[PDB]
Task: structure prediction
Amino acid sequence: MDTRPIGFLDSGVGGLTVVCELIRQLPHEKIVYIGDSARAPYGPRPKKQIKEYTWELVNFLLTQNVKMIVFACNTATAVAWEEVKAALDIPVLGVVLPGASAAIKSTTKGQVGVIGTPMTVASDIYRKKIQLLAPSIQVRSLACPKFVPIVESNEMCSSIAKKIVYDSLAPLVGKIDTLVLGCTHYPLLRPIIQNVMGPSVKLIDSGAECVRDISVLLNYFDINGNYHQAVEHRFFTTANPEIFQEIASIWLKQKINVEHVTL
Amino acid sequence: MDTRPIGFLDSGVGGLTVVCELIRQLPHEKIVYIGDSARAPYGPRPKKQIKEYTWELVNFLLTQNVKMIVFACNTATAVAWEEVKAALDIPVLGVVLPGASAAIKSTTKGQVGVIGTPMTVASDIYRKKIQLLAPSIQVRSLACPKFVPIVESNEMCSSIAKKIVYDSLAPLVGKIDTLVLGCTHYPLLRPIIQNVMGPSVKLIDSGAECVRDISVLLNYFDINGNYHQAVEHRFFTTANPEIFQEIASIWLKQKINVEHVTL
Result:
């Protein structure tokens, strides 16, 4: 079998929710994760510098002998994904495309909403992808900048959190049939988000969608790992490993060890 | 967008159930189908000759400018699929792999059953695929040679048909958690088959699984067609177009025109 691990690059701890999905869906696959906290916000950097940074993360992943690379950073995805994908021989994917495509396939009336980070909403990457494939679908994007913090502080059910989501999503209530959770933190607020949007709205989790694609892409490329096996993942971060495993150990429902590294 | 059609090759009218799934899932995609009835049974031919035949079907499909080829014939798949796939630049898939992979991912206790045509069961292609990936899973294959005829004569609900399925599946009742419908005719007997196997057994429809993979493979290769569009498919057969559209018009719930051709 192909015992090489599937690598994940991200400018943060967010991509770990996709890793959770992966562990959930494909237990037997090895994982290598690189989070570049030290450099922080990618969004407000210059394109040239973001490609520099991304390639650094990609090259690090290559020297982990990964058989596939997954982009978890929307900024890295916006700026580099297509270039790196064209340059590499191994499969290279992001969560945006699958999120967009799922939203398209799932919209009832063509009223698609997408919430996310300020930078994500500022790049309007999701709308661009959606309409690039299905330009007749109406995309309404909304930034929800309180969501990440809430999530990262474990608190998804506080009465304050419930209020925050309630107020942050108001501009969309009653205006859309499907809402793309364009941030990897957001899967953790799903109950609340579904609740605030009503049983009428279809929630699209990009990370979960991405994982589904992985499954098909491992089969197509004949690079599946040992199904009877992973019990050996590797996590890396360029900054603050303490709080990394802190959040990681919570999300991954198990103690995981991080390795502070410097590219 | 990529307006080229998705081609389907098969030694019969069976692959049309996959086309139905495709129309159902991806309405906007053009289809080109080639059925080689004139040559009939592929299974009991020699490998060399089956590769000859397959390539003929593939070359015909290429001169329809297809952006993807789908193998519906288990015999053609067993013998050629990997060779053609290696030779072509466009994506080339079959229904077997997706069927196998789905069964694996879906088996509760590792007791997988697979029914199908005598030739399919004789090649043991499904078991070989399943155990090649997950060799610890127990595969029990069973030939159900009355199934095709029943289906092809429109009769899926006769009290005779119900008996036939009942008796044909007996050897598996109570012995498996998931059953792969290793024949493209069989989707049409699903109600009856599910009924005979009990609510306890998980039915895997290779064709439906295959279609799902297509969706992911169109996105990965950036060759999706116009989402707002197909209303223009093309069906070909090397023998007896009369009964082709006959069955086709039934399955596809619409009148479709076939073009008798000679490779």
Notes: Residues 19 and 31 of chain B are 8 Å apart (CA to CA). Chain B is about 45% helix and 15% strand. The radius of gyration of chain B is 18 Å.
